[PDB]
Amino acid sequence: TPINLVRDLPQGFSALEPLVDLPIGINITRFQTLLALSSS
Amino acid sequence: VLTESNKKFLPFQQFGRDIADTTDAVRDPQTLEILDITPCSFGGVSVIT
Numbered sequence A: 001t002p003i004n005l006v007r008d009l010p011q012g013f014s015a016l017e018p019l020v021d022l023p024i025g026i027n028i029t030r031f032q033t034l035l036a037l038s039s040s
Numbered sequence B: 001v002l003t004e005s006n007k008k009f010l011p012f013q014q015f016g017r018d019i020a021d022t023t024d025a026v027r028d029p030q031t032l033e034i035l036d037i038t039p040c041s042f043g044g045v046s047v048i049t
């Protein structure tokens, strides 16, 4: 959904359709995002 | 009775349920098309004499 705001969550309503169902069945207990990529 | 359905099933949707948990619309596994389901006609028979 296109949103002009980039600093605050917008106001409205939209439903998310599924994209894929992965039949894996692990522990996921913790997760981390992968950003694009400290002396000086 | 199977009939061509004008319902726009989303790509991930296959079945169409009614209030009674009955499928009133299905998607054919072979051809990706949606068919309405309507039960065969029924009713009481009254004998006038």
Ligand SMILES: *[C@@H]1O[C@H](CO)[C@@H](O[C@@H]2O[C@H](CO)[C@@H](O)[C@H](O)[C@H]2NC(C)=O)[C@H](O)[C@H]1NC(C)=O
Pocket (backbone or CB within 6 Å): A026, A027, A029
């Ligand atoms: C999923 O993996 C986690 C690994 O953390 C397991 O969690 C441990 O499960 C045992 C159960 O006997 C606990 O004694 C541990 O305290 C749990 N570890 C942590 C860090 O919480 C788990 O067994 C696996 N299955 C389930 C249902 O969680």
